[PDB]
Enzyme design. Structure first.
Site, PDB file in Angstrom:
ATOM      1  N   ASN A 202      21.397   3.167 -10.611  1.00 55.76           N
ATOM      2  CA  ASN A 202      20.405   4.222 -10.506  1.00 55.76           C
ATOM      3  C   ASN A 202      19.469   4.277 -11.724  1.00 55.76           C
ATOM      4  OD1 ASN A 202      22.007   5.430 -12.461  1.00 55.76           O
ATOM      5  ND2 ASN A 202      22.254   7.368 -11.385  1.00 55.76           N
TER       6      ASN A 202
ATOM      7  N   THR B 190       0.762  -1.261   0.000  1.00 54.84           N
ATOM      8  CA  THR B 190       0.000   0.000   0.000  1.00 54.84           C
ATOM      9  C   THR B 190       0.784   1.298   0.000  1.00 54.84           C
ATOM     10  OG1 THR B 190      -1.679  -1.140   1.262  1.00 54.84           O
ATOM     11  CG2 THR B 190      -1.787   1.283   1.233  1.00 54.84           C
TER      12      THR B 190
HETATM   13  C1  LIG Z   1      12.671   9.137 -11.767  1.00 55.96           C
HETATM   14  O1  LIG Z   1      12.415  10.549 -11.720  1.00 55.96           O
HETATM   15  C2  LIG Z   1      13.213  11.179 -10.739  1.00 55.96           C
HETATM   16  C3  LIG Z   1      12.798  12.646 -10.626  1.00 55.96           C
HETATM   17  O2  LIG Z   1      13.122  13.347 -11.815  1.00 55.96           O
HETATM   18  C4  LIG Z   1      14.704  11.024 -11.032  1.00 55.96           C
HETATM   19  O3  LIG Z   1      15.343  11.365  -9.824  1.00 55.96           O
HETATM   20  C5  LIG Z   1      16.226  12.480  -9.947  1.00 55.96           C
HETATM   21  O4  LIG Z   1      17.466  12.174 -10.538  1.00 55.96           O
HETATM   22  C6  LIG Z   1      18.277  13.314 -10.684  1.00 55.96           C
HETATM   23  C7  LIG Z   1      19.505  12.924 -11.497  1.00 55.96           C
HETATM   24  O5  LIG Z   1      20.304  11.985 -10.797  1.00 55.96           O
HETATM   25  C8  LIG Z   1      18.642  13.878  -9.306  1.00 55.96           C
HETATM   26  O6  LIG Z   1      19.399  15.047  -9.535  1.00 55.96           O
HETATM   27  C9  LIG Z   1      20.317  15.339  -8.471  1.00 55.96           C
HETATM   28  O7  LIG Z   1      19.749  16.236  -7.547  1.00 55.96           O
HETATM   29  C10 LIG Z   1      20.621  16.470  -6.464  1.00 55.96           C
HETATM   30  C11 LIG Z   1      19.880  17.258  -5.400  1.00 55.96           C
HETATM   31  O8  LIG Z   1      18.623  16.657  -5.191  1.00 55.96           O
HETATM   32  C12 LIG Z   1      18.039  17.169  -3.975  1.00 55.96           C
HETATM   33  O9  LIG Z   1      17.105  18.191  -4.271  1.00 55.96           O
HETATM   34  C13 LIG Z   1      16.109  17.731  -5.174  1.00 55.96           C
HETATM   35  C14 LIG Z   1      15.223  18.879  -5.662  1.00 55.96           C
HETATM   36  O10 LIG Z   1      14.594  19.513  -4.560  1.00 55.96           O
HETATM   37  C15 LIG Z   1      15.271  16.645  -4.506  1.00 55.96           C
HETATM   38  O11 LIG Z   1      14.302  16.176  -5.417  1.00 55.96           O
HETATM   39  C16 LIG Z   1      16.166  15.488  -4.082  1.00 55.96           C
HETATM   40  O12 LIG Z   1      15.384  14.523  -3.393  1.00 55.96           O
HETATM   41  C17 LIG Z   1      16.164  13.321  -3.227  1.00 55.96           C
HETATM   42  O13 LIG Z   1      16.905  13.353  -2.026  1.00 55.96           O
HETATM   43  C18 LIG Z   1      16.074  13.576  -0.905  1.00 55.96           C
HETATM   44  C19 LIG Z   1      16.932  13.704   0.355  1.00 55.96           C
HETATM   45  O14 LIG Z   1      17.713  12.533   0.520  1.00 55.96           O
HETATM   46  C20 LIG Z   1      15.043  12.449  -0.764  1.00 55.96           C
HETATM   47  O15 LIG Z   1      14.121  12.715   0.275  1.00 55.96           O
HETATM   48  C21 LIG Z   1      14.260  12.207  -2.049  1.00 55.96           C
HETATM   49  O16 LIG Z   1      13.567  10.982  -1.878  1.00 55.96           O
HETATM   50  C22 LIG Z   1      15.242  12.096  -3.205  1.00 55.96           C
HETATM   51  O17 LIG Z   1      16.006  10.924  -3.019  1.00 55.96           O
HETATM   52  C23 LIG Z   1      16.149  10.223  -4.271  1.00 55.96           C
HETATM   53  O18 LIG Z   1      17.131  10.865  -5.074  1.00 55.96           O
HETATM   54  C24 LIG Z   1      18.419  10.883  -4.483  1.00 55.96           C
HETATM   55  C25 LIG Z   1      19.401  11.659  -5.358  1.00 55.96           C
HETATM   56  O19 LIG Z   1      19.128  13.047  -5.243  1.00 55.96           O
HETATM   57  C26 LIG Z   1      18.882   9.441  -4.245  1.00 55.96           C
HETATM   58  O20 LIG Z   1      20.151   9.418  -3.630  1.00 55.96           O
HETATM   59  C27 LIG Z   1      17.891   8.728  -3.329  1.00 55.96           C
HETATM   60  O21 LIG Z   1      18.328   7.400  -3.118  1.00 55.96           O
HETATM   61  C28 LIG Z   1      16.512   8.762  -3.965  1.00 55.96           C
HETATM   62  O22 LIG Z   1      16.599   7.923  -5.098  1.00 55.96           O
HETATM   63  C29 LIG Z   1      17.322  16.033  -3.234  1.00 55.96           C
HETATM   64  O23 LIG Z   1      16.819  16.512  -2.006  1.00 55.96           O
HETATM   65  C30 LIG Z   1      21.838  17.239  -6.971  1.00 55.96           C
HETATM   66  O24 LIG Z   1      22.676  17.601  -5.893  1.00 55.96           O
HETATM   67  C31 LIG Z   1      22.567  16.382  -7.999  1.00 55.96           C
HETATM   68  O25 LIG Z   1      23.646  17.111  -8.549  1.00 55.96           O
HETATM   69  C32 LIG Z   1      21.549  16.013  -9.075  1.00 55.96           C
HETATM   70  O26 LIG Z   1      21.097  17.211  -9.665  1.00 55.96           O
HETATM   71  C33 LIG Z   1      17.377  14.206  -8.508  1.00 55.96           C
HETATM   72  O27 LIG Z   1      17.657  14.549  -7.166  1.00 55.96           O
HETATM   73  C34 LIG Z   1      16.387  13.025  -8.529  1.00 55.96           C
HETATM   74  N1  LIG Z   1      15.058  13.398  -8.059  1.00 55.96           N
HETATM   75  C35 LIG Z   1      14.353  12.647  -7.200  1.00 55.96           C
HETATM   76  C36 LIG Z   1      13.149  13.274  -6.543  1.00 55.96           C
HETATM   77  O28 LIG Z   1      14.639  11.479  -6.913  1.00 55.96           O
HETATM   78  C37 LIG Z   1      15.120   9.582 -11.376  1.00 55.96           C
HETATM   79  O29 LIG Z   1      16.418   9.570 -11.960  1.00 55.96           O
HETATM   80  C38 LIG Z   1      14.092   8.923 -12.319  1.00 55.96           C
HETATM   81  N2  LIG Z   1      14.453   7.511 -12.544  1.00 55.96           N
HETATM   82  C39 LIG Z   1      14.632   6.961 -13.754  1.00 55.96           C
HETATM   83  C40 LIG Z   1      15.085   5.526 -13.809  1.00 55.96           C
HETATM   84  O30 LIG Z   1      14.463   7.565 -14.820  1.00 55.96           O
HETATM   85  C1  LIG Z   2      -3.394  10.319  -5.880  1.00 54.64           C
HETATM   86  C2  LIG Z   2      -3.720  10.279  -4.386  1.00 54.64           C
HETATM   87  C3  LIG Z   2      -3.258   8.932  -3.881  1.00 54.64           C
HETATM   88  C4  LIG Z   2      -3.402   8.631  -2.370  1.00 54.64           C
HETATM   89  C5  LIG Z   2      -4.751   8.574  -1.638  1.00 54.64           C
HETATM   90  C6  LIG Z   2      -4.310   8.166  -0.214  1.00 54.64           C
HETATM   91  C7  LIG Z   2      -5.351   7.931   0.885  1.00 54.64           C
HETATM   92  C8  LIG Z   2      -4.538   7.556   2.134  1.00 54.64           C
HETATM   93  C9  LIG Z   2      -5.348   7.302   3.408  1.00 54.64           C
HETATM   94  C10 LIG Z   2      -4.328   7.041   4.511  1.00 54.64           C
HETATM   95  C11 LIG Z   2      -3.436   5.777   4.463  1.00 54.64           C
HETATM   96  C12 LIG Z   2      -4.213   4.476   4.706  1.00 54.64           C
HETATM   97  C13 LIG Z   2      -3.246   3.295   4.704  1.00 54.64           C
HETATM   98  C14 LIG Z   2      -3.930   1.994   5.103  1.00 54.64           C
HETATM   99  O1  LIG Z   2      -5.049   1.964   5.633  1.00 54.64           O
HETATM  100  O2  LIG Z   2      -3.203   0.853   5.053  1.00 54.64           O
HETATM  101  C15 LIG Z   2      -4.107  -0.174   5.483  1.00 54.64           C
HETATM  102  C16 LIG Z   2      -3.137  -1.329   5.658  1.00 54.64           C
HETATM  103  O3  LIG Z   2      -3.883  -2.448   6.145  1.00 54.64           O
HETATM  104  C17 LIG Z   2      -2.466  -1.703   4.342  1.00 54.64           C
HETATM  105  O4  LIG Z   2      -1.513  -2.725   4.583  1.00 54.64           O
HETATM  106  P1  LIG Z   2      -1.012  -3.582   3.298  1.00 54.64           P
HETATM  107  O5  LIG Z   2      -0.227  -2.927   2.228  1.00 54.64           O
HETATM  108  O6  LIG Z   2      -2.325  -4.062   2.709  1.00 54.64           O
HETATM  109  O7  LIG Z   2      -0.381  -4.927   3.916  1.00 54.64           O
HETATM  110 CA   LIG Z   3      24.042   4.779 -13.628  1.00 55.07          CA
HETATM  111 ZN   LIG Z   4      -3.047  -1.730  -0.114  1.00 51.97          ZN
HETATM  112 ZN   LIG Z   5      -3.078  -5.609   2.128  1.00 50.64          ZN
END
Ligand SMILES: *[C@@H]1O[C@H](CO)[C@@H](O[C@@H]2O[C@H](CO)[C@@H](O[C@@H]3O[C@H](CO[C@H]4O[C@H](CO)[C@@H](O)[C@H](O[C@H]5O[C@H](CO)[C@@H](O)[C@H](O)[C@@H]5O[C@H]5O[C@H](CO)[C@@H](O)[C@H](O)[C@@H]5O)[C@@H]4O)[C@@H](O)[C@H](O)[C@@H]3O)[C@H](O)[C@H]2NC(C)=O)[C@H](O)[C@H]1NC(C)=O
Ligand SMILES: CCCCCCCCCCCCCC(=O)OC[C@@H](O)COP(=O)(O)O
Ligand SMILES: [Ca+2]
Ligand SMILES: [Zn+2]
Ligand SMILES: [Zn+2]
Ligand SMILES: *[C@@H]1O[C@H](CO)[C@@H](O[C@@H]2O[C@H](CO)[C@@H](O)[C@H](O)[C@H]2NC(C)=O)[C@H](O)[C@H]1NC(C)=O
Ligand SMILES: *[C@@H]1O[C@H](CO)[C@@H](O[C@@H]2O[C@H](CO)[C@@H](O)[C@H](O)[C@H]2NC(C)=O)[C@H](O)[C@H]1NC(C)=O
Ligand SMILES: [K+]
Ligand code: NA
EC number: 3.1.4.39
Length: 782
Positions: free
Chosen positions: A666, A159
């Site tokens: 990645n 979920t």
């Molecule tokens: C699916 O689509 C996504 C979104 O476009 C792609 O993900 C992006 O990839 C690019 C290129 O590698 C990354 O660019 C880097 O950005 C960093 C800075 O990034 C920071 O700020 C951005 C913008 O506000 C933010 O989105 C980032 O968020 C990441 O990190 C957060 C803190 O840890 C975390 O909460 C969030 O979940 C996200 O984590 C994910 O990305 C990071 C890498 O940033 C990765 O380590 C982690 O494991 C997660 O996968 C972050 O705060 C720069 O410093 C670099 O130079 C570079 O510009 C983007 O950050 C990244 N965006 C997101 C949201 O993930 C995927 O590539 C794409 N996948 C495919 C297969 O196509």
């Molecule tokens: C585009 C909008 C998307 C999201 C709409 C989100 C509504 C969220 C309401 C709150 C979270 C409820 C989560 C929940 O009730 O989990 C019940 C669990 O038993 C699920 O466990 P599991 O994956 O089935 O094992």
């Molecule tokens: Ca790679």
């Molecule tokens: Zn579910």
């Molecule tokens: Zn379930």
């Protein structure tokens, strides 16, 4: 500290943000213990239930009642949903004939169609076959609107990862919600479906729809509902919000039901006990539709009816225990069930031995109902590796089974398995002025919906993993006009410039309108800065990279009739320098001769040469790639047996094959610096994967090279590994195991594009939107 002494008088489910010290009356207050003292009393009334009865009609208003049947209830926006049917002789919405909605029919003051997302948990796609006998309201939405036969969830098919993927358009590895439970080694904290930690914002990445809406000045209703709020109250609340003043009314709403998931777990998906829950959800959809009709909104709002995942038969009797394979399971922690993630019980425990654990878990029982993977080895289509919260060691569990740590019923259903598994597929229906009327669309992935919901709301989506335009065919209007990416590197077209004598590579070869036929959809565009050559040949074309010393892509057509020819014994080790390409930008056979572990193969297979003559082209140094012997077993079977089989079955095929470098797992093309392995003593980089994209005419009656309409595509991303440990039967003939491996590593063209920096299908007779749909297609083999 929150001052609970305040009152929710005239404040129930208010939409304004309210932080300490003031107490709250919003839908989520109970979860923050910040509700005013009279929240439950004022906001959660239950008196007299949820339905008008004849004896209530034109009653005098008692504010104690759950909903109202008094004459003023309409303009106050809080009638019971069946008020008009019971009190004014109207019909339930479900009983009205379906009629095409060609433009929104919205009351005074509505500038755009509201969007209502109606999400249902654990709604297996196949439940829809129960039809109007069980789900008449939903069947009306399905038949009269736009529906897919199913929608593919993300892995793991549970979920939290899926609802947040729906909200963000991101893979879990990117948005961060990689399971219902997870451990973050940097926070040194644990997230659970139940409990308060999940409320901390540090867990949630990307940009969910409600935030995208808000930041662009579009107001959103709640996308969370407290478990304790009955469904009927949720529905009445949405309808009340829809009745607000123009300057307060939200544009996007979400409803969530925890059914039919709960009942699916208890009874399994084919239980007769599933009928009741499904009826109840349908009644809820009917309340909403009756409510909307009461408000003159039923031909105004866009409704999305969508599930998070499916449900499989899983019982206590089908549980594998790790204790049967491992000596001391008490020292590991296992995220268990329909998937496995393993880490030391004590974080960072130095005596953790992952290689020994994996070895004891590999092919140890004939009927073994799970398979261990280091996460970089998981099929690339799962996109499940690039996050610190994903344990290195993963178990992919067979459908219908559970994995548990040890032995130390009440459940007959579960989910979480590989997202291509049929039982995991879920539902999608769109109904309203912006969707098409009575239209079926092919199955698609839930990562695509965020873009479409943004389209439906006039929003610009934050960067995400959907392919914007790929779902344009679901919409009557508000479609997104995609633009072709601009090519970054133009090719060189080298002619002869060298002599066989110019080359010192250690290679020996004992004995001594190409495009039209071989680039049916145009040359791929290179979308990064690099240097490469186009090379033409009788039987194939290629974009040879002078940087990575091998083709980025090799394209060739094989007609239905094509002849499979052998490789003559004297040509076995034949490798010929290529006088079009510098010795300095070539591989050398000496590196292979000396690397005791790595051999080589060819992207265009000599087996499919068009003449004993042309076959000599296949042995060029510029057609060669580094391959482990283990991989060669797979690749040769593919080149020699399978490509011809596909040509035969599909009326010819066009093939594009090439290397992929993703050492940091990645999902994106590696830069040079990220490549970590080379052929021994050389600078020839070793691919982590090899891809093939096999295209033909959708109308199989036309040959691939003379196709006038839609295309058919299947593709793969095969792991380049030094052993076949993944394939438990690999000791047998390749005919007994290779196709099985390939099926598991099926892929989208789009996946290959991310991994290569290439853009495919740029010259065709189809719309760009259609090509985008084609690129997102996944051939599942289910
Ligand atoms: C699916 O689509 C996504 C979104 O476009 C792609 O993900 C992006 O990839 C690019 C290129 O590698 C990354 O660019 C880097 O950005 C960093 C800075 O990034 C920071 O700020 C951005 C913008 O506000 C933010 O989105 C980032 O968020 C990441 O990190 C957060 C803190 O840890 C975390 O909460 C969030 O979940 C996200 O984590 C994910 O990305 C990071 C890498 O940033 C990765 O380590 C982690 O494991 C997660 O996968 C972050 O705060 C720069 O410093 C670099 O130079 C570079 O510009 C983007 O950050 C990244 N965006 C997101 C949201 O993930 C995927 O590539 C794409 N996948 C495919 C297969 O196509
Ligand atoms: C585009 C909008 C998307 C999201 C709409 C989100 C509504 C969220 C309401 C709150 C979270 C409820 C989560 C929940 O009730 O989990 C019940 C669990 O038993 C699920 O466990 P599991 O994956 O089935 O094992
Ligand atoms: Ca790679
Ligand atoms: Zn579910
Ligand atoms: Zn379930
Ligand atoms: C907590 O909330 C209550 C209710 O609003 C506050 O009580 C009011 O306090 C003021 C004086 O500061 C009185 O004049 C009002 O009569 C009180 N209202 C009622 C109905 O009791 C209280 O001040 C708040 N606690 C704080 C501010 O710490
Ligand atoms: C992997 O499985 C083997 C059994 O196949 C385990 O080997 C046992 O090791 C213990 C101590 O390590 C010995 O006392 C036993 O004699 C072995 N059992 C048998 C039946 O041979 C090994 O411990 C397992 N490794 C891990 C990491 O769990
Ligand atoms: K070798
Ligand atoms: Na094997």
């Amino acid at each position: 500290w929150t001052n609970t002494s305040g009152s929710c008088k005239g404040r129930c489910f208010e939409l304004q943000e309210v932080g300490p010290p003031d107490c709250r009356c919003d839908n989520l207050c109970k979860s923050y213990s910040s509700c005013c003292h009279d929240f439950d009393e004022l906001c959660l009334k239950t008196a007299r239930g949820w339905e008008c009865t004849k004896d209530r009609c034109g009653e005098v208003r008692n504010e104690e009642n759950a909903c109202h049947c008094s004459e003023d209830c309409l303009s106050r926006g809080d009638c019971c949903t069946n008020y008009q049917v019971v009190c004014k002789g109207e019909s339930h919405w479900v009983d009205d004939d379906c009629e095409e909605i060609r433009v929104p029919e919205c009351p005074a003051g509505f500038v755009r169609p509201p969007l209502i997302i109606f999400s249902v948990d654990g709604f297996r796609a196949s439940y829809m076959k129960k039809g109007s006998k069980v789900m008449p309201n939903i069947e009306k939405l399905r038949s009269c609107g736009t529906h897919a036969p199913y929608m593919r969830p993300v892995y793991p098919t549970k979920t939290f990862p899926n609802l947040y993927t729906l909200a963000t358009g991101l893979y879990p590895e990117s948005h961060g919600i990689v399971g219902n439970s997870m451990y973050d080694p940097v926070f040194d904290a644990t997230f659970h479906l139940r409990g308060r930690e999940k409320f901390n914002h540090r867990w949630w990445g990307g940009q969910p729809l409600w935030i995208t809406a808000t930041k662009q000045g579009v107001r959103a209703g709640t996308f969370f509902w407290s478990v304790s709020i009955p469904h009927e109250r949720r529905i009445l609340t949405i309808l009340q919000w829809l009745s607000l003043p123009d300057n307060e009314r939200p544009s996007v709403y979400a409803f969530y039901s925890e059914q039919p998931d709960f009942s699916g777990h208890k009874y399994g998906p084919f239980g007769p006990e599933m009928t009741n829950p499904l009826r109840e959800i349908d009644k809820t959809v009917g309340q909403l539709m009756d409510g909307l009709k009461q408000l003159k909104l039923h031909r105004c709002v866009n409704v999305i009816f969508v599930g998070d995942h499916g449900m499989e038969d899983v019982t206590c009797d089908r549980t594998e225990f790790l204790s049967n394979y491992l000596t001391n399971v008490d020292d590991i922690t296992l995220v268990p069930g329909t998937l496995g993630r393993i880490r030391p019980k004590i974080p960072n425990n130095l005596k953790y031995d992952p290689k020994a654990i994996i070895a004891n878990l590999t092919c140890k029982k004939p009927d073994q109902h799970f398979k261990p993977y280091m996460k970089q080895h998981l099929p690339k289509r799962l996109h499940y590796a690039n996050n610190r919260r994903i344990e290195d060691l993963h178990l992919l569990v067979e459908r219908r089974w559970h994995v548990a740590r040890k032995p130390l019923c009440f459940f007959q259903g579960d989910h979480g398995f590989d997202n291509k598994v049929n039982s995991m597929q879920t539902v999608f229906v769109g109904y309203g002025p912006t969707f098409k009327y009575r239209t079926k669309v092919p199955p698609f992935e839930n990562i695509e919906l965020y873009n479409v919901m943004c389209d439906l709301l006039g929003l610009k989506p934050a960067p995400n993993n959907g392919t914007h335009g790929s779902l344009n065919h679901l919409l009557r209007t508000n479609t997104f006009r995609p633009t072709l990416p601009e090519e970054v590197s133009r090719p060189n077209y080298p002619g002869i410039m060298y002599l066989q004598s110019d080359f010192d590579l250690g290679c020996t070869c004992d004995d001594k309108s190409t495009e039209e036929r071989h680039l049916l959809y145009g040359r791929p565009a290179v979308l990064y800065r690099t240097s490469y050559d186009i090379l033409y040949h009788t039987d194939f074309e290629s974009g040879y990279s002078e940087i990575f010393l091998m083709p980025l892509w090799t394209s060739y057509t094989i007609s239905k009739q094509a002849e499979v020819s052998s490789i003559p014994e004297h040509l076995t080790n034949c490798v010929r320098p290529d006088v079009r390409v510098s010795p300095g930008f070539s591989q050398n056979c000496l590196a292979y001769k000396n690397d005791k572990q790595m051999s080589y193969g060819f992207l265009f297979p000599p087996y499919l040469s068009s003449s004993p003559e042309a076959k000599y082209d296949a042995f060029l140094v510029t057609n060669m790639v580094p391959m482990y012997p283990a991989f060669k077993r797979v690749w040769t079977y593919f080149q020699r047996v399978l490509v011809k089989k596909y040509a035969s079955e599909r009326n010819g095929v066009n093939v594009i094959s090439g290397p992929i470098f993703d050492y940091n797992y990645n999902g994106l093309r590696d830069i040079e610096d990220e490549i970590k392995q080379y052929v021994e003593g050389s600078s020839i980089p070793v691919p982590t994967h090899y891809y093939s994209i096999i295209t033909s005419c959708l109308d199989f009656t036309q040959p691939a090279d003379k196709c006038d309409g839609p295309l058919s595509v299947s593709s793969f991303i095969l792991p380049h590994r030094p052993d076949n440990d993944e394939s438990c039967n690999s000791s047998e003939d390749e005919s007994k195991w290779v196709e099985e491996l390939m099926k598991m590593h099926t892929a989208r063209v789009r996946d290959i594009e991310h991994l290569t920096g290439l853009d495919f299908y740029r010259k065709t007779s189809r719309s760009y939107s259609e090509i985008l749909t084609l690129k997102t297609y996944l051939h599942t083999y289910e």
